[PDB]
Point group: D2
């Protein structure tokens, strides 16, 4: 499933930074019960940056196992070297995942033509559906709509997570691609606007802690009841902003811990513990959402 509220799930860790199975199970049970459409495992919010490919794979397999068919799982598979992205993708073939979320190469700043060849080659060497992921603030490059349109012609490139926060992109992309190509927001604070403009859902950080509200908001939005959805969004808006008051996923892991959904808020360096000021900002956002 590539529609509705999709959680960009945290990788819960113990005090030594290793995946905590008991916390992860609890989160998955929570998403099943709360009506989340799918789980992105080991994307950016899941600390893909600081797990090696072995641990990355373990977490995705553990997520599949615990999910036990009750909720679809999409694996993060992005890399800034095309050969590495292919290799990582091969690790998940015939695993049970329903798709992959794959980011524009970060740091090395390829051209549009380079981005096109990068994703075409990934797509060629798998049967798994691919969701492109654009986030220039993190990567230093910007997959423009024209190039998205070229890539949408590839059979198994089926959608895009668009995280510019630039809402003009929704209809620039939409007019260049087929009606079943999926447009997903990657920016929680502008996500309802994104859907109102024609987007089909959101890959969401807020959904980690407000899963039920997020699920209802996205369904109301898909039904065209945008005013009914804005009431919920307005409740969630302090969360949409303050979950990024310190680098993601520091705030959301703290929030998960405060709610009792995970055992510890431990991250891996270069992420560092939440400051006390961040604590009180996030706690106030959780209260505004009605979660504490």
């Amino acid at each position: 499933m590539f529609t509705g509220s999709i959680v960009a799930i945290v990788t819960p860790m113990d005090e030594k930074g290793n995946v905590c199975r008991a916390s992860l199970k609890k989160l998955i049970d929570y998403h099943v019960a709360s009506g989340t459409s799918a789980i992105v495992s080991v994307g950016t919010t899941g600390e893909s940056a600081t797990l090696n490919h072995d641990e990355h794979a373990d977490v995705v397999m553990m997520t599949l196992d615990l999910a036990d068919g009750r909720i679809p799982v999409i694996a993060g598979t992005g890399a800034n070297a095309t050969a590495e992205a292919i290799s990582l993708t091969q690790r998940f073939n015939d695993s049970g995942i329903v798709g992959c979320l794959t980011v524009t190469p970060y740091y090395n700043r390829p051209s549009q033509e380079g981005l096109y060849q990068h994703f075409k080659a990934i797509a060629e060497h798998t049967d798994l559906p691919q969701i492109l992921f654009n986030v220039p603030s993190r990567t230093g490059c910007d997959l423009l709509p024209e190039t998205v349109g070229r890539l949408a012609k590839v059979k198994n490139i089926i959608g895009i997570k668009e995280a510019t926060g630039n809402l003009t992109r929704v209809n620039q992309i939409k007019e260049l691609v087929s009606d079943d190509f999926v447009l997903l927001s990657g920016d929680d604070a502008s996500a309802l606007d994104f859907m109102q403009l024609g987007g089909h859902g959101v890959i969401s950080v807020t959904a980690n802690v407000a899963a039920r509200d997020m699920a209802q908001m996205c369904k109301l939005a898909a039904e065209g009841h945008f005013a009914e959805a804005r009431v919920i969004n307005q409740r969630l808006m302090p969360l949409h902003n303050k979950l990024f008051v310190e680098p993601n996923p520091i705030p959301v892991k703290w929030a998960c811990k405060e709610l009792g959904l995970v055992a510890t808020d431990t991250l891996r360096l270069p992420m560092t513990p939440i400051t006390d000021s961040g604590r009180e900002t996030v706690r106030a956002a959780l209260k505004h959402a009605g979660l504490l």
Copy 2:
């Protein structure tokens, strides 16, 4: 040596995309003869992003052996995961490299406190001199002068490659650190200005193909003879700019091949072959510089 013209050297490759030993030797001899003060091996211009850590270590060791004590070699050791940066740094402990060039974590956007804990841990796991590297347009994050001052108090952290193109940083950093701390431009087009403000040199892309002029420009600059250094800078300014007409190192590798310095201009995806129009652009800038 952490002063004068330091080349951010390309990793020349055969048509298969693997390191070409004869081309690399030719490049190193060229830098020895040209007066280049040091080599950065497998930094960004050397395609650190598309080489695995074993391949990257093989290229550093091969560059060191080929230099044969004639020119100091600095290893690129950057990673966006701290444990991974330590691990890569440790491959070079007691190897003969004189120091490491280590970038701010890219993509995961750490806070200033995160940047501090990252570089500090790295420095504590090595005896090698560490040069910080700040390049916000590639990384999505910006190591501010205040934090550079903090890290400069670590015995082992001895300078910064500053690639913002924002020349105010030279004296903001200088007043916060000791006189022994080295300040290096990471932006060829503004590097002479950077030295005129008190910078000690440049880690240069232009130097790959104009090593003699670059060495002489930096020597004049260190001596305070700025007007004569500008005459060289003006010859070189089209290269400073046009070597980024397409994503680096696509232009510089083609220019190396055109000058007979390397056998092929092959790169790894997501870098792609230079376009015809970029070919003509770089040819004209080489001509302007008097090289072709």
Copy 3:
């Protein structure tokens, strides 16, 4: 009328730069026949910058006279000194205009509190409805939603022309103001998106030359037929962009001349004649729109 397609009308000039009555009449007849909701007289596209207050007033009175009750007229009245904005506003009291379009002070970069006091004082000393105008790219300041919300409580501040091109502003403002406060796009290329998000119309440069299409697009948008409206918008999109290929109103005045709607494309300095390249770009956009 402050809803639908509102033309930011050109001030047609003869060869000496003086208002051309015959061309202006033709334009007004054209807007009456084409279903334009209203005319903004002597706003930015009408060269408010280069007419003095006497000429400014003459053009607005001439526009009223020629309009002859058939179409409502809104006068541009903005100034970067509060006392000048008041004085200019007093010139139009009891003139027949239905409202004023008043820009954030440009150049002097006041604070939010300053912007609040600026517009409150203007509003206090007239009965005429006021439409706030935010356009940071031109002014160097940005009237934020919070401050719009404070100003909306003033009886006769009735709406805003929002020209950031940042579509998140629509619902940020809307939730802070009453349901009859009017939200108008000031950015043609993102205007349909703006209306789809809840905006009530557009103060438009494209409407100078594609009035009928613009009127229909805005009505379809108000009725919720967004797909039907996008077909028209897609026809107009090259115009929405290329009318700004050179500084507005240079392209649109040329376009008006090519269509025969005005006698000359003359502007006042520092606007200069369209280049030949601009000519062919704009002509191609007019053809794509089906106007030539």
Copy 4:
């Protein structure tokens, strides 16, 4: 004189918002005694935006008479309409001012060709020396070095006040113009760096309240004694920054009043009184500078 520390002088006002003659005389005496090289009368810091042209001419003439041949006076003559800039310039022909400081048209965003025709026409209607003024954050447009080179060939255009804060412009402009062409910082915080790169001085806001230190800093800089100039710059750096904590000239006028240099800190709307928090911020920076 178009060299050294040139003050962008406030227009001190009584509580009614009109020019206060006793405060202005006190300021001019202060600059004569302090070693300030020249006064810019009714530039931006002098509230050119909120004074009509008659009031602005009255203040320039009063500043000239009070200077009584002891210190050269430069008139601000900027306007975004070319005919208006000419008219204002002509008020000062044969008046005793030594030159004009004239800004790129703000708000109407002319092309580079427009900027060329604007400044050229102005220069042709006067015998007075003209200093160009580029400040893109206020004006919405950017006079590039290439165009500065073009205008410098006009006999009458003799320098530029560069307020981008982008220090690369110093040598981009310098290589395109003759050695007689003057380069002046318009950004106090980067002005010493600007002079170290070959700049000839600064038109300064800081100098309003720290005229002695500024004159001495610029004198040391012209002599090449940069390290000793930095010691002064560091004393002054909190002012360089905090004098813009609220929109200029709100902070500098309050600081003038606190030092007993003017009778009131009154400004014209849309500038508003300094906040309590800004009061405390500016007080601390004055203390740091050793003035209070």
